[PDB]
Structures are given as structure tokens and as C-alpha cells.
Structure 1
């Protein structure tokens, strides 16, 4: 019945039927290919309870995406340092970007969502009016023709791939509308069930809530589709303890004011109610 049981079953499935694989760095993982879960967004927000999810991070990262920013320093100054390692001088130099400034992640998510097709110079350049604004295109389509089957937002850009500090995990997401409800399916090519995935679920569940607010629709379902679903070997024991835990009722997300555009959203507009996560592992 509870939505979190689906995630727990997926983690259990990988431990149960996964194959021993390897990484880019070489650490070792248990992996399964092709998984799908469906989380209900009706009167509840999917922020996992068996293990704490960095809420401030998902909120600040998404507002940073919408802003169209590719500067990691703009997210770091907000207290969210999850992209700092990829924007460092050392990492950018190992990829061959020496003339590039520090913090410049290349044409990642934000740039693809707002300026698809545009030529990328640097993080400080003005890209207004350049490229295809997929985000606004999504919102407008939901407002004009909700039955459309092409309401898609793609971050996977083969042409811009060599320039990105890190290739997109969330390659593509599609929206759907029935009975005044807004659903969303995410295609995640690679997902770490131990840390990344629970953060990813929350992020896109928030995106769906945001767009539903602007279009006057109600949040429906969130279909999470995975490509390479893995669990790192050094996390087998902690996750074993997490599987034994009983899920607490999912919290509730509340938007405190009526906003017209997606750009007008602020941290103060969001309120999480009833989030009681289990201790640390």
C-alpha cells in the first residue's frame, strides 16, 4: 500500500537478482537493468522515511535548474555542495577544460531545459532568446493542448555531450494529463539506489507539483523508469538494516502562494508537513 515499499522492493530485488559489475572508477556494484515504479502524488509527497533525504538540496538544485544556470558556485553559495567536485579546477582539467573557469559545468541540465540547440560559450554568457525552451514549451502545451503525446523535456544532447562536466542521469521526462491530473515519467539511464535515487524521486515529484500548480492541475502519478539500477558493494550492509525498517507516512508538500510563472518560485513558497525520517545508518 505504502509508496516507499516499492523502492524497498527494488533495492531488495537488486540484492536478490543482481550481477556483480564494475564502475568508471572501479569500486564494484550489484546491478539489474530495467526497473519501473509508480509513486502516487495525491495528497502526499514521496520523500523517503527509512533514510533521510536532503530536502534543501533537491529544492535548491531544482530552482537552480529552472534558472538555467550551469555555474556550480551559484548552488554552493546556497549551502548545497553536491556539484562542487565536478566544478573544481582539478576535475575540469582532467577532462581537458583548462581555459574554462572554475564552477563551469558546461551545457548541463539547466542549459538543456532552457536553451536546447544554442551554442555554449561559458556560464557567464547571456543565452536569452537562444535555443528551444523545453520547460516553457511543456507548460504552454499543457495549457493549450493537454492531450498532446509529445510533452517531453530532454536533457540528453549527443552534440553537447563532450562539453558537459557530467553526462545527464535523468535523460528525459514526459508529462501526461487525464481527469485534471498531471503525471510524469522519468527515464533515468543510471541510478544509485543507496544515495542518488531517493533524491531523484523527490526532485521530479517536486517538478510535477510545481508545473501542476501553474497549470491548475492536480498532481497525479510519478513513474520512475531506470536503466542501470545499481547498489555499491560497500552499501550492502547499511541497506540491509534499512530494509528492516518500517516506513512512516509520507509527508505533505504545500505551496503557500499562487505563482504565475515557473521562474517566480522561491524557497519560501514550499512547506513540508509531517516528515519524520528514521535515524542515520
Structure 2
């Protein structure tokens, strides 16, 4: 079926993936360099071998698409994918008066009581970002997250470039352009970032009237990351095609360091014994065409019928 390339990457890593020490304190089995591709005319590459929440994907993408850097948008749609990053800022600031929270991610993963204290504090934070406009403005704003690199690349003139909106125009005028690239990697900022963009750079290509996208990920966590990463960019490819009145082609996923955290081995294995089902089908709103103005209800997933979810530890 459609998702086989994923399953083959997992198998691949389990076999010849070498043990390499990673930034976190968990180990990894990894390979360097891998291309994988999905034919979007065959369906949406949302894994059926485990329930992946399409909502977190759909709302996070619109977030980037709006050039939004404030977590407040995510939280209103019950998306806490980025909470961790806002919170850490809030914690080491002068206005924080409460439990230590140092190394919170590790400490919570290691202490029962702490985790509960953590969720009380993070619960407080999420309420402040939601209601206190000044708080949201001072702590919910991440600054350098995708939607900013995509839609507001700050120039040396202090100006700002809409990389994405710009390339979409070139796609409509010079479809045969071999430079329809959007990059999220800025050398001046990357050395002072908690996490440089994993999704370094992507490229569009148009031939025979159908759109294609190739993403370059410098670091991927197979079991947890990739299932989300694939759906995000396959979805981007759809929306861009919708806008450009083009047909959908292929999503090519190139990798740098593709890895599997050792604390995920049993889970990946169990998944590897499941039989892919017929991939779901995506439906974008026919009437709406400005994908920058698209909202939740304009993107639908039909016939998604996956296997139960596989819970697994997040590495630290």
C-alpha cells in the first residue's frame, strides 16, 4: 500500500542502523541519507498502521500558513504541540514566581508528584496566554518558528520577505522554475536556537500540469516525528496545488539523520506486524482558493480507518 515506504524506513533502520549517541540522553539507531516518495494521486499518506491525529497536523499547518508565531492560535484549537517552548521562556523570566521547574521535561518524566505540579503550572500558563493579551504577546509569541521563516524572513535592511507567498507566485508564472525553494535555515539565528528547524528546506516542481514537493529533513525521529512530518508536507502540497489550479503529484521526503530512539523498539516492532489498510482521501474546499485564508473546515479527511494508537515514551 501507500505507506510502505515508511514501514521500509523503519525496517531499514532496525537492520543496519548504527547506535549513535544523540543530543538527548536516550540512545539512537540511525542512518544518514534516505529518500522516500509518495504518490498523492493514490491517496493521503496518513498512516493507517496507527491512529495519527490529523487535527494537530491540520491546525498547525494553517498556523504556519498564517505567518503566525503566537501559540495562542494553537491552544484555541486544543493544540499543545508548541506549549513546551513558550513555557520554558516563561519559567526563566523575572515574572515567574513559583516551583523551580528547572529541566522540567526530564524531572517530570522522572517524578510522579512533579509531573502533576508541572501540569498545574503549564495549565496556568495556557490560561494566561489565552486571556491576558499582553501576556500572550510577551510569552506566547515564539518569534522564530516556521510561519515566520516562511512568511517574514527578516532582511539585513530590517525588512521582511514572504518567501512562501513569493514562490507561489513564481509557480503561477514560471512553473518550470528549478529554484522554487523555500528555506527555513538562517545561519545568523541558528547558533542561538533551542532547536534549529528540522525541516530545513523544501522545493516545488511542476511538470505535465501537476505539482510536486521535496522536503529535506536534517533530523527525523522515525516512530514519533515522521508520521506527522509526512502528513504536514503532503497537505501543504495539496493546498499549494489547489491555489495554483494544478494537479497533485508526488511528495518526496529526503532525510539527513533518520533515527529511532531505542526506547521505541517494541512499539515500532508491534506496528511492523500490522497490515496497511486503504489510505484515506483528502478533500479541500472547492469554493475557497486563497490557502492563506483557509481554516479548519476547508480541509477534510475521508475514509480514515486506522489501527489503534501506539503510546510510547518521548525521548529526553
Alpha-carbon distance change, 74 to 192 in structure 1, aligned in 2, over 3 angstroms? same
The yes-or-no answer on 1:182 pairing with 2:211 is yes
Aligned to 1:250: 279
Q: Which has the higher contact order (CA 8 A, sep 6+)?
A: 2
Count of residues in correspondence between the two structures = 267
Query: Residues 58-207 of structure 1 correspond to what in structure 2 (within 5 A)?
Result: 58-89=57-88, 93=92, 101-118=138-155, 130-162=159-191, 164-207=193-236
> How far apart, in 2, do the equivalents of 1:205 and 1:73 lie?
25
Per mean C-alpha deviation after superposition, the further-off stretch among 73-82 and 31-40 is 73-82
Q: Secondary structure at the match of 1:102?
A: helix
Superposition CA RMSD, Å: 1.9
How far the C-alpha of 1:53 sits from its partner, in A, is 1.2
Q: Any idea what SS the aligned residue of 1:29 has?
A: strand
Assess, with a 3 A threshold, how the Cα gap between structure 1 residues 92 and 153 changes in structure 2: closer, same or farther. farther
Any stretches of 5+ residues in structure 2 without a counterpart? 93-101, 104-136, 311-316
Q: What TM-score do you get using the length of structure 1 for normalisation?
A: 0.90
The reply to whether residue 235 of structure 1 matches residue 264 of structure 2 is yes
Q: 1 CA distance for matches of 2:255 and 2:231?
A: 15
TM-superposed CA distance for 1:249, in Å, is 0.8
Shift of 1:187: 0.1
CA distance in 2, matches of 1:107, 1:92: 19
Post-superposition shift, 1:3?
2.0
Deviation (angstroms), 1:69? 1.3
Higher Cα radius of gyration? 2
Q: Secondary structure at the match of 2:26?
A: coil
Per-residue CA distance 1:39-70 (angstroms, 9 max, x = gap): 00004111001011120011011100011111
Shift of 1:245: 0.5
Moved over 6 A (4+): none
TM-score normalised per structure 2: 0.80
**Aligned-residue offset at 1:91:** 7.4
Distance 1:90 1:216 in 2: 42
1:27 deviates by: 0.7
- Which structure has the highest helix share of the two? 2
